[PDB]
Coordinates of C-alpha atoms and ligand atoms in Angstrom, one line a residue:
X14 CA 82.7 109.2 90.1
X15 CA 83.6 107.3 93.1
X16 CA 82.4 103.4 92.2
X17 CA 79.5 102.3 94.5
X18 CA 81.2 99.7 96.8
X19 CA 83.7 102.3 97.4
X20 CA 81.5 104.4 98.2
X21 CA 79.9 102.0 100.2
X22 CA 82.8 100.8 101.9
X23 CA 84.2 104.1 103.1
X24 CA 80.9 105.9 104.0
X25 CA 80.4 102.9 106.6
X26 CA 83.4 104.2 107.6
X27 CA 82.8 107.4 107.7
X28 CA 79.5 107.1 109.7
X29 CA 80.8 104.3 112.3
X30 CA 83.3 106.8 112.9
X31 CA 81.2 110.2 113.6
X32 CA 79.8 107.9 116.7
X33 CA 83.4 107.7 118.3
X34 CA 84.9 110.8 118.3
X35 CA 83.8 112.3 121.4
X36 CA 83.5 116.2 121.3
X37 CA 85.6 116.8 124.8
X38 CA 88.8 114.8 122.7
X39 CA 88.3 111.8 124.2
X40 CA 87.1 108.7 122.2
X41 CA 84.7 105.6 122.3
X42 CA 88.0 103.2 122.4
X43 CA 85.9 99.9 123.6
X44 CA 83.1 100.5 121.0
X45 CA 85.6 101.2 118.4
X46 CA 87.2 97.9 119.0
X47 CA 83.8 96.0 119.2
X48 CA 82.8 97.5 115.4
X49 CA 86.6 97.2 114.2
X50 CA 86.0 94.5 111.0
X51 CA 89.2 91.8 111.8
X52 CA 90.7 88.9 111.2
X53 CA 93.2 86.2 113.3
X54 CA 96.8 85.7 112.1
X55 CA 97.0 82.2 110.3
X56 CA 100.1 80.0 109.6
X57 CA 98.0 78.1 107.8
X58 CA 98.1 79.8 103.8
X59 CA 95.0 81.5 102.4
X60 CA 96.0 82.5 98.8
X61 CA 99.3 81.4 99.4
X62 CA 100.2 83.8 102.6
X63 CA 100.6 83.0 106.0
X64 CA 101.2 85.3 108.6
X65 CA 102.1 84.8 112.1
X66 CA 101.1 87.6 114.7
X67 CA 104.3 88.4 117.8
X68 CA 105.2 91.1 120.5
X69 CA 108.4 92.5 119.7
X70 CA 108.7 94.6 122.8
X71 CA 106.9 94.3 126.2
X72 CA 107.6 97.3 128.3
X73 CA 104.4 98.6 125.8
X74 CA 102.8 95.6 124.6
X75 CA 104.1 96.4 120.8
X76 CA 103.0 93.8 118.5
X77 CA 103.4 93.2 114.6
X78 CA 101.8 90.6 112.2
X79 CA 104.2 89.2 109.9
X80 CA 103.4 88.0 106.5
X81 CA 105.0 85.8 104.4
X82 CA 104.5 83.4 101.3
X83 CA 103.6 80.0 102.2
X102 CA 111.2 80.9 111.4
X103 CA 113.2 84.7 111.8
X104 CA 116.4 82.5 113.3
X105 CA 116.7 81.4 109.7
X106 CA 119.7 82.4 108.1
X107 CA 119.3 85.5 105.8
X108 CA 118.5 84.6 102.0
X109 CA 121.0 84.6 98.8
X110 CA 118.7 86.4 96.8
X111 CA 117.5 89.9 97.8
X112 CA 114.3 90.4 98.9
X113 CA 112.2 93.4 100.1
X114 CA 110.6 93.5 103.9
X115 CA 108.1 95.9 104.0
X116 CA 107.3 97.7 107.2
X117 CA 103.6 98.5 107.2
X118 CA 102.0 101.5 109.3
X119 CA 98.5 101.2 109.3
X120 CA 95.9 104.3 108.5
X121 CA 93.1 105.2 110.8
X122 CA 94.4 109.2 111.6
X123 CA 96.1 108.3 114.4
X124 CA 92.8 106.8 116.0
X125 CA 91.3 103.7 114.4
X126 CA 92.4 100.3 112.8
X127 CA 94.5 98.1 113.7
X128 CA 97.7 95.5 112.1
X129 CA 94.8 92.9 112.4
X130 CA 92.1 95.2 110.7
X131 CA 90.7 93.5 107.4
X132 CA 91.3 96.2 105.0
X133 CA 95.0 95.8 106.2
X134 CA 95.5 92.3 106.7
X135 CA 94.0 92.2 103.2
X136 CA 96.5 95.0 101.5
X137 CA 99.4 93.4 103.5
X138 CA 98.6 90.2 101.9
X139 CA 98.7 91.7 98.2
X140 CA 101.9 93.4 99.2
X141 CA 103.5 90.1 99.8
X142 CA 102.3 88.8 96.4
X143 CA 103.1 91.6 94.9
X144 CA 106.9 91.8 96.0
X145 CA 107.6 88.5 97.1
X146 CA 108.9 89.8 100.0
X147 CA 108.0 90.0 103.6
X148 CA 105.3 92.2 105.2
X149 CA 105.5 93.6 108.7
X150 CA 102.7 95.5 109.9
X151 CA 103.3 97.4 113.0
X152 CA 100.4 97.3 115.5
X153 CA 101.3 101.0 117.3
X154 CA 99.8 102.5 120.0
X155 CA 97.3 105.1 118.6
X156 CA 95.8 108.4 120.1
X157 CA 94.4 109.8 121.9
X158 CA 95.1 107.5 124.5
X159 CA 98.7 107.3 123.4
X160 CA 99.8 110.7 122.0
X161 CA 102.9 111.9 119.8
X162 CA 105.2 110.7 120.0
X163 CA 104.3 107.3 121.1
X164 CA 103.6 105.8 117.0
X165 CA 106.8 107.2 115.9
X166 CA 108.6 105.3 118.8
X167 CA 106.7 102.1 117.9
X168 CA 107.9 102.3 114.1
X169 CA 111.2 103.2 115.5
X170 CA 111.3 100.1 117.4
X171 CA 110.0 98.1 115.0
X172 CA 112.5 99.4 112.3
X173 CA 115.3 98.1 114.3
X174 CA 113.5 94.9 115.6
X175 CA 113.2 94.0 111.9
X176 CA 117.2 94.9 111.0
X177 CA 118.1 92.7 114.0
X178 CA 116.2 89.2 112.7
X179 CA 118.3 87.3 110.8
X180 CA 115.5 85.5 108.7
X181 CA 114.8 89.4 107.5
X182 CA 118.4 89.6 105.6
X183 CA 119.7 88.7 102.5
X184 CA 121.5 89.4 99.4
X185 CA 125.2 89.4 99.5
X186 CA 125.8 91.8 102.2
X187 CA 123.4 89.9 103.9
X188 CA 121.4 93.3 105.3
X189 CA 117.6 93.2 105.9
X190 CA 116.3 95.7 102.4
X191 CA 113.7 97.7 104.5
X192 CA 111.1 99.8 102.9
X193 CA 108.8 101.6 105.4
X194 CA 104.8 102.1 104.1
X195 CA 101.8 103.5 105.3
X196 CA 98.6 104.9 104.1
X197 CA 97.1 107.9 106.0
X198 CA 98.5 108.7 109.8
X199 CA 100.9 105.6 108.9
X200 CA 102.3 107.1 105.7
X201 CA 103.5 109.8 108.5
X202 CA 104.9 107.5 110.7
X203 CA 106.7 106.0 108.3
X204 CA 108.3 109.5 107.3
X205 CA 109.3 110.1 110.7
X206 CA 110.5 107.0 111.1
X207 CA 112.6 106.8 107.7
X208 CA 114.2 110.7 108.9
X209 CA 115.3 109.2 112.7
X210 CA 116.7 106.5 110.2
X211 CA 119.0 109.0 107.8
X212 CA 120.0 111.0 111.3
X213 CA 121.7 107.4 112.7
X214 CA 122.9 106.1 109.5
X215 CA 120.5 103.0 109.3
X216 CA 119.6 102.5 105.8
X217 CA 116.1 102.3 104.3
X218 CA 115.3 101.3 100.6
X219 CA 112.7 103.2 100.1
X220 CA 109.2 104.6 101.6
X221 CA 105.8 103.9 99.9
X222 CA 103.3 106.7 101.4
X223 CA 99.7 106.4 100.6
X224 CA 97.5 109.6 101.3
X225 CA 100.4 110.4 104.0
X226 CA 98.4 112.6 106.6
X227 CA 100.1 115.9 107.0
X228 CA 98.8 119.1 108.0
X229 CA 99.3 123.1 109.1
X230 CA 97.3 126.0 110.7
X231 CA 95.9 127.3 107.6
X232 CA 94.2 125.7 105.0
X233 CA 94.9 125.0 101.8
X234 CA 93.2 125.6 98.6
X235 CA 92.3 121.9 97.6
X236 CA 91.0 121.3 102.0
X237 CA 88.7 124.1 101.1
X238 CA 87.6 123.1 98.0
X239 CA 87.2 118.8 98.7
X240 CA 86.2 119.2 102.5
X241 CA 83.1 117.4 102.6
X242 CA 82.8 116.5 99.2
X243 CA 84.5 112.8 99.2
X244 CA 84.1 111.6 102.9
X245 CA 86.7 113.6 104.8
X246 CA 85.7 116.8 106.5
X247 CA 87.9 119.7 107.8
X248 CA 86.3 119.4 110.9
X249 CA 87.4 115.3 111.5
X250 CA 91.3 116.3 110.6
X251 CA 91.2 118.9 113.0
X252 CA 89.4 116.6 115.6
X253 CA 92.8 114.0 114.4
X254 CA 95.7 116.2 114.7
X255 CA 94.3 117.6 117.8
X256 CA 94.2 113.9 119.3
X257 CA 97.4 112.8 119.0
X258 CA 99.6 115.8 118.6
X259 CA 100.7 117.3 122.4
X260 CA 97.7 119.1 124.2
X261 CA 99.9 122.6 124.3
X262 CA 100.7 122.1 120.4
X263 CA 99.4 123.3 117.0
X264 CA 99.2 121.9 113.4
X265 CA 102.4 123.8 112.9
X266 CA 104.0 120.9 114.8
X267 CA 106.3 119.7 113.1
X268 CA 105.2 116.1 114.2
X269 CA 102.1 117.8 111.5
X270 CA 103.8 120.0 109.3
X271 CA 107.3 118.5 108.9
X272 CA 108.3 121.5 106.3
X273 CA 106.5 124.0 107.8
X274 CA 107.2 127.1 110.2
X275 CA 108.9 124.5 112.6
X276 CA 110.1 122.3 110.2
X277 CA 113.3 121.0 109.3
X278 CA 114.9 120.7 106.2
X279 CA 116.4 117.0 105.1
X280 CA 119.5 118.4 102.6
X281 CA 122.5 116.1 103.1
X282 CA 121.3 113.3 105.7
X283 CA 121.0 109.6 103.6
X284 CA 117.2 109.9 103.2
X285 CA 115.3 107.1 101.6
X286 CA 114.1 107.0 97.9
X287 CA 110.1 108.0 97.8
X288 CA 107.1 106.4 96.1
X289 CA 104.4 109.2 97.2
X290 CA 101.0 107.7 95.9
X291 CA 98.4 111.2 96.3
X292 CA 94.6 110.4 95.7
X293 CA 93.2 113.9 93.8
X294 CA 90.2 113.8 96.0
X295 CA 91.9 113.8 99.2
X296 CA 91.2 117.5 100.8
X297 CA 95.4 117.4 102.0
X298 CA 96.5 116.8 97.9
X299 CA 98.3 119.8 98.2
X300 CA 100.1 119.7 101.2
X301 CA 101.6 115.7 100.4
X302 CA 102.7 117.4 96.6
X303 CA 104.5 120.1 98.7
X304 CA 105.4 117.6 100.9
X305 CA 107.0 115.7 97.4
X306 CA 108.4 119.3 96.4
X307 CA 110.0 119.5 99.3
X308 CA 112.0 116.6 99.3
X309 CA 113.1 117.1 95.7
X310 CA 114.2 120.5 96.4
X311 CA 116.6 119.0 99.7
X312 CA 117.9 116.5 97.1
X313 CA 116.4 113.6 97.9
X314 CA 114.6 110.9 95.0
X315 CA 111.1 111.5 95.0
X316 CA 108.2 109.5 92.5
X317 CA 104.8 110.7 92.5
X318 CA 102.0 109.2 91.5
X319 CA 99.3 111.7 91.1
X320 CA 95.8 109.6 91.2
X321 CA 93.2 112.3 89.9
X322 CA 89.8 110.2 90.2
X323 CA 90.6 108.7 93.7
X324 CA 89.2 109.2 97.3
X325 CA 90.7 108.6 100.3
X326 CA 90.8 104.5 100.4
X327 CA 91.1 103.5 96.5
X328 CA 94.1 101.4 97.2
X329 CA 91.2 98.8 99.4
X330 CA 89.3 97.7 96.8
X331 CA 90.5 96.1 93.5
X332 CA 88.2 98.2 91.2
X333 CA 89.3 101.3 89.6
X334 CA 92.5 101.7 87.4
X335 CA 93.9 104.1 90.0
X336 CA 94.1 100.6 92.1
X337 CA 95.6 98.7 89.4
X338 CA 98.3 101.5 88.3
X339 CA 99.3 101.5 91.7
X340 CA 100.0 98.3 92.6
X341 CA 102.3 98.6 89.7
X342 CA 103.9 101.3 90.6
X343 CA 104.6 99.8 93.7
X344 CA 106.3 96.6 92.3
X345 CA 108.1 98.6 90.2
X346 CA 109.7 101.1 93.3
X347 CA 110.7 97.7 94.9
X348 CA 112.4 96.0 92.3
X349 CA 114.2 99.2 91.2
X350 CA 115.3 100.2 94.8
X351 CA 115.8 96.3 95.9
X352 CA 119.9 96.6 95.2
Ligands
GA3_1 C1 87.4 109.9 109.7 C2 88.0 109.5 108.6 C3 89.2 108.6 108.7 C4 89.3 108.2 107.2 C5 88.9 109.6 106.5 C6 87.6 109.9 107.2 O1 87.3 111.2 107.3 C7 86.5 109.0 106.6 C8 87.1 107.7 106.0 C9 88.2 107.1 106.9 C10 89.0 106.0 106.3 C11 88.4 104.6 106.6 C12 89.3 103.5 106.4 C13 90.8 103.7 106.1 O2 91.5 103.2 107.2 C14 91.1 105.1 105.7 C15 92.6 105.4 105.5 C16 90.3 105.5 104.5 O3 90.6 105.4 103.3 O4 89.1 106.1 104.8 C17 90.4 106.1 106.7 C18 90.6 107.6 106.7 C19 91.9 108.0 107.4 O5 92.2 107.5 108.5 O6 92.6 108.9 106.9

């Protein structure tokens, strides 16, 4: 089953979050950041990470947290090493860079890769709607290939891999395609529970809705907050293969690492999403986690959590040079 402090965890959630979604499409921003559980960057190492918090461009307040093991005009490093960019979860709508459950996952990601974390603080929905995230991980893509301090190896090149769980794990697709269409290389994406969607449902959203936190009814509410107010989930900013999609054959896409929790409602649509991808040509890994929710990767207690973290260490040193 799900364990109990998962369940806990993500039912507190769940509930906190019924409160702010308003029914009109607007929602409860202020209370939402009053109940957000965060914590302060610190230079000072907890566990042996620091991380530093900076705005890396002011015409929209864009700020990142950087983590590191425990500065970016230091000359790149002899030895490769991976920099993560980090899009957090929340659908579009909640969390933040300095958000516990992400501080906390960026943290094992830095001592998992001993590499660099970077986790991108973008302007959310419905205030700020597409394609407002995508230009912040844009921006922050190039930020981080500009900072010395973010290169090494011999061609002394910052080795990107862009991440995200949920509404990040899209972000960081649309991010890594803008990439392949102007020839900026990315190692590799890590998507965990990548939110995509479409007008009809699939078979596993009618099955799971309801049954393991997320409800049809809160995705809809989602994609209808941040996607353009004339638009459908047939957007491609939604459905990237879809009726408006676009097909990736030939442009230098990244390598994949698509982590799917079995008990997410959108399963099918991220394995589709997977299939597609393979069938343009492009290197795709799936990790298919059967007995996992939505949020497994947040808590250190189920195998699903364990496997994965391997898997992910294992992407990174394979796709590193
Ligand atoms: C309304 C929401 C938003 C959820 C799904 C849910 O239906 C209930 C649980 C939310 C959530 C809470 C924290 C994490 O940011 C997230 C990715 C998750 O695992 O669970 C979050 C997740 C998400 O953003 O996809």
């Amino acid at each position: 089953v799900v364990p109990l402090h998962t369940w806990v965890l993500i039912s507190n959630f769940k509930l906190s979050y019924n409160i702010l979604r308003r029914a009109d499409g607007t929602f409860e921003r202020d209370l939402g950041e009053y109940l957000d559980r965060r914590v302060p960057a610190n230079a000072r190492p907890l566990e042996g990470v620091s991380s530093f918090d900076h705005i890396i461009d002011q015409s929209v307040g864009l700020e990142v947290r950087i983590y590191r093991a425990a500065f970016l005009t230091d000359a790149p490093a002899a030895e490769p090493f991976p920099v993560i960019i980090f899009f957090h979860g929340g659908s579009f709508v909640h969390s933040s860079a300095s958000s516990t459950i992400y501080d906390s996952l960026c943290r094992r990601f830095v001592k998992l890769s001993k590499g660099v974390v970077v986790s991108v603080n973008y302007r959310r929905a419905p205030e700020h709607r597409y394609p407002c995230a995508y230009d912040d991980g844009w921006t922050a893509l190039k930020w981080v290939m500009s900072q010395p301090f973010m290169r090494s190896g011999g061609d002394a090149q910052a080795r990107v891999f862009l991440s995200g769980d949920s509404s990040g794990g899209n972000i960081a697709h649309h991010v890594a395609v803008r990439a392949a269409d102007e020839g900026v290389k990315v190692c590799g994406n890590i998507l965990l529970n990548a939110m995509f969607g479409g007008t009809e449902r699939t078979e596993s959203e009618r099955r799971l809705d309801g049954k393991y936190f997320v409800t049809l009814q809160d995705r809809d509410w989602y994609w209808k907050a941040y996607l353009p107010e004339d638009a459908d989930r047939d957007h491609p900013a939604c459905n990237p293969f879809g009726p408006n999609g676009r097909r990736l054959g030939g442009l230098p896409f990244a390598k994949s690492l698509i982590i799917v929790s079995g008990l997410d409602l959108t399963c099918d649509r991220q394995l589709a999403y997977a299939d597609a991808l393979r069938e343009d040509g492009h290197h795709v890994k799936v990790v298919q986690c059967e007995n996992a929710t939505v949020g497994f990767y947040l808590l250190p207690n189920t195998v699903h959590y364990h496997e994965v973290m391997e898997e992910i260490s294992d992407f990174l040193n394979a796709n590193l040079y």
